[PDB]
Write a protein that binds this DNA or RNA. Structure first.
Ligand SMILES: [Mg+2]
Ligand SMILES: [Mg+2]
Ligand SMILES: [Mg+2]
Ligand SMILES: [Mg+2]
Ligand SMILES: [Mg+2]
Ligand SMILES: [Mg+2]
Ligand SMILES: [Mg+2]
Ligand SMILES: [Mg+2]
Ligand SMILES: [Mg+2]
Ligand SMILES: [Mg+2]
Ligand SMILES: [Mg+2]
Ligand SMILES: [Mg+2]
Ligand SMILES: [Mg+2]
Ligand SMILES: [Mg+2]
Ligand SMILES: [Mg+2]
Ligand SMILES: [Mg+2]
Ligand SMILES: [Mg+2]
Ligand SMILES: [Mg+2]
Ligand SMILES: [Mg+2]
Ligand SMILES: [Mg+2]
Ligand SMILES: [Mg+2]
Ligand SMILES: [Mg+2]
Ligand SMILES: [Mg+2]
Ligand SMILES: [Mg+2]
Ligand SMILES: [Mg+2]
Ligand SMILES: [Mg+2]
Ligand SMILES: [Mg+2]
Ligand SMILES: [Mg+2]
Ligand SMILES: [Zn+2]
Lengths: 129, 218, 65, 71, 101, 216, 82, 132, 24
RNA sequence: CAGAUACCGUCGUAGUUCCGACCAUAAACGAUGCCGACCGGCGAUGCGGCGGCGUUAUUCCCAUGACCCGCCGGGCAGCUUCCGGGAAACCAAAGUCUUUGGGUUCCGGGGGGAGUAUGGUUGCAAAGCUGAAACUUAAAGGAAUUGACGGAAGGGCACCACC
RNA sequence: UUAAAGUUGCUGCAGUUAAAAAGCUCGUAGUUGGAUCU
């Protein structure tokens, strides 16, 4: 059945992107999906989005800028040490120059970059570029 | 002596188009070898990568011909690949050089790390894909030269890609596809959208729309 | 036409292995004799002379000389 | 596909080694019939005594006699 | 290499089809694959029409017609030329031939 | 239109449509076209929306006008209902027509005596002539079309939603396009009704040639 | 793009589609740079001014080059509301 | 079977296309025209080509020929084509229209047009072809 | 042909199963 | 027929049929695991639902049924398309794959030897499941392409084919 | 014996026709599991 809603969300937006669509309807939504999208949004890869609140689970409608090539998830969530991070990004990202690994950490959800700053490890969620 | 038969031709011979980038900007079809030739240069050199015989069969026997693969680079900006079939191998070669010259593409180069000096490698990692060969180029730190097989190393030398991490999987023996794929890869480097290019495009009068008067004169 | 338009030569080379016969057919181009170019053209060939440019008349003019 | 859970570990590792047997190479090395049937018993060289001299017919597309020894 | 997408037989979304014996052969073929042909003609043929028409004890008696459904196993057709092979592309057209002028 | 009272469509124009019946399209409806539809009546005829049509006309006008040399506008009609119309249009506007047979390789082959490199491409029907359209995919031509309620919009840039089927409908659309680019370029006038009668752009048919030559 | 010192090191700076924002390729010949003219709001005649669009070859095949041209025009007010 | 070679028809095409004003509908006229205008060997070639120049002219005066483009017949077909009846066929005192068309006009504030006549909608719905 | 050599194999097997019996 | 213990024919046992026990294999095929998400159109068809002029079951009122025009959800499919894939044939899935990670199960690792040997186990038996090795070998194979050929189908010609 | 081998594949391969998805469904352990609480 449906497990890992995050995965299904980002598949959907990545597809609506390759299709070159303007908006997306991604459902259901999560307090995780939301903070992920937000971290994505601060760097601009996406745009503003709006949460249709239904009495059950969310739907989220996302506005889109062509700036997103790939958006992905890594299942299972792996526990990523600080020391490991390098390896991870060097595997995942197109370049040292750009793109992000998003992890949840004790601090909050964030970018590999910002966590490097805060000196925290955590679990991997996904990545984008 | 060269007689231009196209709109783009006249503009070139009449020096109305300063650099090649005014062409690439508007992604015009380049139909005449002499455009490329006049524009550069002694800066062009070329390889015969491979000469392979192909055979067809008729009631009479096998009727043989030749495929030439020529790679024409200008070290540092541009590469081209061309393939030609002919009965006579000579004809085939210079033909393939015409064909290759016709297809020339600009190659983006990025930094590996802190950006210092002039771009020495691929901007981010790209994948050329041709007919079961998968070539993939990856950023490399300065000095590492090109790590790959001989064939894509030729192209990438001629592109002015100085250092690269090449992976290639597939049936990589077959030369046409190896070369055509790696060529794909260095094509897609100006189609890759990074955060650099995020500024909205200010447009420009197309050459055609700009020079149309001096065109009407000829 | 092939009679006056082309020149054929057949020969025998005599070697340890045997004799190799050979044939060389050469075709000449057309018009006035330069010691080559036999004058009379192919019965197929049709040459059209381009129209000599004629002045388009404006108003009738009479000129006495 | 492959099973990607966390607590999946052994199922992966276990399964791998079974398929590792289906590999002609590794099977030869780690079964040990190979070494048993090998006349050398795993040595580089062996010392031997000459029983007789023997001509051996070449295989088809080319004609020769190969000069061999029965040791 | 798969030749037809429909595999020659019309069976879709059911497992198995009741087999029928060929007209010509007697060879056994599933009812879906069988090349079927319907025949409506007149009992008596062209000339004997005009002939018999005179010998009636009835005025304006219209000849009865003979109705027969035929099945042809794939082989038998191609021999009888009820069906002939056609090109890779022109294969795909399932529109029945134009007997209607 | 710029919402402008000048460019806003006048009644006398409307009547021309309603007579020539450009607001009547086929029973099939392409999903790309659904934007221009209004509603389907009974008898399956879809009713094209005319304000929308008008605006598309004006749009394609601006697109044509933008071009400096008027000979860089190629105008193409494959079938017979377009032929005369296109020629006249070309004459009024000074653009280069191709009516009758298009020759594949016209745009992409520099050896041909037909060869031309037009900046823009105006086209009567997308369905009827794919050929010029797909060539315009190799050479970068922006493209205009007259699109019925059913047409593929593949490789058209700016489409005009009308009946392209019946003669009277095609004639009208062309003549109106012409009247427009001309009222735009500054030639002619926005006041005076154009000298040229739309009736000129129609398709003959031999029956009418016979009727009118044997009336004399 | 820019090295540390701030120079623009690049051959050329490619144009992105106006509709879908993809990069228009060095050799993509299905691409368009379309010119739409501007009238004088009093007269209805031609200015000498125009607003320009680009559309890559992707969107042209999808046919939705049209839709996008259109709503681009609306965003520029070259097409009336409704 | 008497059928003209590529030579015959190609030659008469270019000859006509350049010289259209000099040719006439008589055979020997254009025969002697082509003994001059072009350079041809033998006879049976000449005669045939001229015959086709002629034949092609008898087809030209009918209307447009597929092979040739002359500015003279472009101009005569600019005369022939240009026509117009005293009144337009687009002018009718009464033009008939369906209720819905009237609605669509009512959106554009044209529900005030005089020439209109609203005609009764057709009651049955069958626009479709009976499949089989 | 495959079907048949599967057959020849079962003939052979059966015969082996005779020629060694559990009394041997 | 050279031979035919084979195709063809006349016969005909077991079987084919029903009941009661066994057997567990089929090109058991969509040669395409199952649950799930998203990604183009287009008409059709089967089942339920919802709406809509207008016909019919005779003439008016409601039901109801038959056709008709749509809409919704499941189905069996089809056509179409530079969605994308693919070695290609082809696939709206065989798509969302070097831009590589939704969950999960079975399972393949050159061709032979071989689904054989042996042991274990199931059956009444025929066999089924489980299943090696020595040896041997540079290919075996998959799609497509030109040929050549066919005792395959269509056209075409020729008084060295006929009428 | 290691790399080459993305020819043991966690990263990272395959399974329509090349080697390959069980006849079919139930099913325990095993793996996996929707939203939601500063
Ligand atoms: Mg490899
Ligand atoms: Mg190899
Ligand atoms: Mg076959
Ligand atoms: Mg079922
Ligand atoms: Mg079955
Ligand atoms: Mg007998
Ligand atoms: Mg028998
Ligand atoms: Mg019997
Ligand atoms: Mg049982
Ligand atoms: Mg089985
Ligand atoms: Mg199976
Ligand atoms: Mg299963
Ligand atoms: Mg129903
Ligand atoms: Mg109802
Ligand atoms: Mg349905
Ligand atoms: Mg994978
Ligand atoms: Mg094996
Ligand atoms: Mg087994
Ligand atoms: Mg046993
Ligand atoms: Mg084959
Ligand atoms: Mg190894
Ligand atoms: Mg490695
Ligand atoms: Mg493998
Ligand atoms: Mg097989
Ligand atoms: Mg297989
Ligand atoms: Mg199965
Ligand atoms: Mg369980
Ligand atoms: Mg949860
Ligand atoms: Zn049969």
């Amino acid at each position: 059945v449906r497990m890992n809603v995050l995965a299904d969300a980002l598949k959907s937006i990545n597809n609506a992107e390759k299709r070159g669509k303007r908006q997306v309807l991604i459902r259901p939504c999560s307090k995780v999906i939301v903070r992920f999208l937000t971290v994505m949004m601060k760097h601009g890869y996406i745009g503003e989005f709006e949460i249709i609140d239904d009495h059950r689970a969310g739907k989220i409608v996302v506005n889109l800028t062509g700036r997103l090539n790939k958006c992905g998830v890594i299942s299972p969530r792996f526990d990523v040490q600080l020391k490991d991070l390098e390896k991870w990004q060097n595997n995942l990202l197109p370049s040292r120059q750009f793109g992000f690994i998003v992890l949840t950490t004790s601090a909050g959800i964030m970018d590999h970059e910002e966590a490097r700053r805060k000196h925290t490890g955590g679990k991997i969620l996904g990545f984008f570029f | 002596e060269w007689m231009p038969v196209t709109k783009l031709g006249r503009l070139v011979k009449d020096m109305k188009i300063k650099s090649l980038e005014e062409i690439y900007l508007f992604s015009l079809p380049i139909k005449e070898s002499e455009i490329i030739d006049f524009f550069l240069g002694a800066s062009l050199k070329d390889e015969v990568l491979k000469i392979m015989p192909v055979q067809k069969q008729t009631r009479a026997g096998q009727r043989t011909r030749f495929k030439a693969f020529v790679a024409i680079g200008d070290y540092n900006g541009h590469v081209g690949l061309g393939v030609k079939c002919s009965k006579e191998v000579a004809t085939a070669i210079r033909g393939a050089i015409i064909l290759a010259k016709l297809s020339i593409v600009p190659v983006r180069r990025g930094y590996w790390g802190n950006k210092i000096g002039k771009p020495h490698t691929v901007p981010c990692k790209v994948t050329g894909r041709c007919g079961s060969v998968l070539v993939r180029l990856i950023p490399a730190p300065r000095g590492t030269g090109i790590v790959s097989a001989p064939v894509p190393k030729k192209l990438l030398m001629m592109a002015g890609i100085d250092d690269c991490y090449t992976s290639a999987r597939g049936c990589t023996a077959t030369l046409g596809n190896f070369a055509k794929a790696t060529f794909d890869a260095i094509s897609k480097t100006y189609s890759y959208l990074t955060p650099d290019l995020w500024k909205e495009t200010v447009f420009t009068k197309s050459p055609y729309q700009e020079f149309t008067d001096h065109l009407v004169k000829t | 036409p092939v009679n006056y338009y082309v020149d054929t030569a057949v020969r025998h080379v005599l070697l340890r292995q045997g004799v190799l016969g050979i044939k060389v057919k050469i075709m000449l181009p057309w018009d006035p004799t330069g010691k080559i170019g036999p004058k009379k053209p192919l019965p197929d060939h049709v040459s059209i002379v381009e129209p000599k440019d004629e002045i388009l008349p404006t108003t009738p003019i009479s000129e006495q000389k | 596909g492959k099973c990607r859970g966390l607590r999946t570990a052994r199922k992966l590792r276990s399964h791998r080694r079974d398929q590792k047997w289906h590999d002609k190479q590794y099977k030869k090395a780690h079964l040990g019939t190979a070494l048993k049937a090998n006349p050398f018993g795993g040595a580089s060289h062996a010392k031997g005594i000459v029983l007789e001299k023997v001509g051996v017919e070449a295989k088809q597309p080319n004609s020769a006699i190969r000069k061999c020894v029965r040791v | 290499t798969k030749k037809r997408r429909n595999n020659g037989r019309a069976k879709k979304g059911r497992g198995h089809v009741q087999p029928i014996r060929c007209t010509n052969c007697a060879r056994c073929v599933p009812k879906d694959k069988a090349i079927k042909k319907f025949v409506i003609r007149n009992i008596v043929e062209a000339a004997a029409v005009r002939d018999i028409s005179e010998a009636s004890v009835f005025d304006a008696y219209v000849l009865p017609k003979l109705y027969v459904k035929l099945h042809y196993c794939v082989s038998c057709v191609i021999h009888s030329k009820v069906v002939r092979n056609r090109s890779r592309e022109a294969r795909k057209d399932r529109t029945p031939p134009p007997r209607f002028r | 239109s710029g919402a402008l009272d000048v460019l806003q469509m006048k009644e006398e124009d409307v009547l021309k449509f309603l007579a020539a019946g450009t607001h009547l399209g086929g029973t099939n409806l392409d999903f790309q076209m659904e934007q221009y539809i209004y509603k389907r009546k009974s008898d399956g005829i879809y009713i094209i929306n005319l304000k929308r049509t008008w605006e598309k006309l004006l749009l394609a006008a601006r697109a044509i006008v933008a071009i400096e040399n008027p000979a860089d506008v190629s105008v193409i009609s494959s079938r017979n209902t377009g032929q005369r119309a296109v020629l006249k249009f070309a004459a009024a506007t000074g653009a280069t027509p191709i009516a009758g047979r298009f020759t594949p390789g016209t745009f992409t082959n520099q050896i041909q005596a037909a060869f031309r490199e037009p900046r823009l491409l105006v086209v009567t029907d997308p369905r009827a002539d794919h050929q010029p359209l797909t060539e315009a995919s190799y050479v970068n031509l922006p493209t205009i079309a007259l699109c019925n309620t059913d047409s593929p919009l593949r490789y058209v840039d700016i489409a005009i939603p009308c009946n392209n089927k019946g003669a009277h409908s095609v004639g009208l659309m062309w003549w109106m396009l012409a009247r427009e680019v001309l009222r735009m370029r500054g030639t002619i006038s926005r006041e005076h009704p154009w000298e040229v009668m739309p009736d000129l752009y129609f398709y003959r048919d031999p029956e009418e040639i016979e009727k009118e030559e044997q009336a004399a | 793009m820019q090295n540390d010192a701030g120079e623009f090191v690049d051959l050329y700076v490619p144009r992105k589609c106006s509709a879908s924002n993809r990069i228009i390729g060095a050799k993509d010949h299905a691409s368009i740079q379309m010119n739409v003219a501007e009238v004088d709001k009093v007269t209805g005649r031609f200015n000498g001014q125009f607003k320009t669009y680009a559309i890559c070859g992707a969107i042209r095949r999808m046919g939705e080059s049209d839709d996008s041209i259109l709503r681009l025009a609306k965003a520029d007010g070259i097409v009336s509301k409704n | 079977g008497r059928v003209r070679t590529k030579t015959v028809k190609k030659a008469a095409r270019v000859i006509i296309e350049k010289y259209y004003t000099r040719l006439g509908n008589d055979f020997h006229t254009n025969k002697r025209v082509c003994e001059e205008i072009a350079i041809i060997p033998s006879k049976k070639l000449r005669n045939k080509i001229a015959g086709y120049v002629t034949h092609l002219m008898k087809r030209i005066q009918r209307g447009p020929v597929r092979g040739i483009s002359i500015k003279l017949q472009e101009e005569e077909r600019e005369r022939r084509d240009n026509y117009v009846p005293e009144v337009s066929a687009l002018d009718q005192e009464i033009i008939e229209v369906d209720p819905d068309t009237k609605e669509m006009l009512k959106l554009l504030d044209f529900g005030s047009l005089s020439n209109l006549q609203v005609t009764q909608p057709t009651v049955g719905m069958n626009f479709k072809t009976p499949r089989g | 042909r495959a079907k048949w050599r599967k057959k020849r194999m079962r003939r052979l097997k059966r015969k082996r199963r005779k020629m060694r019996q559990r009394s041997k």
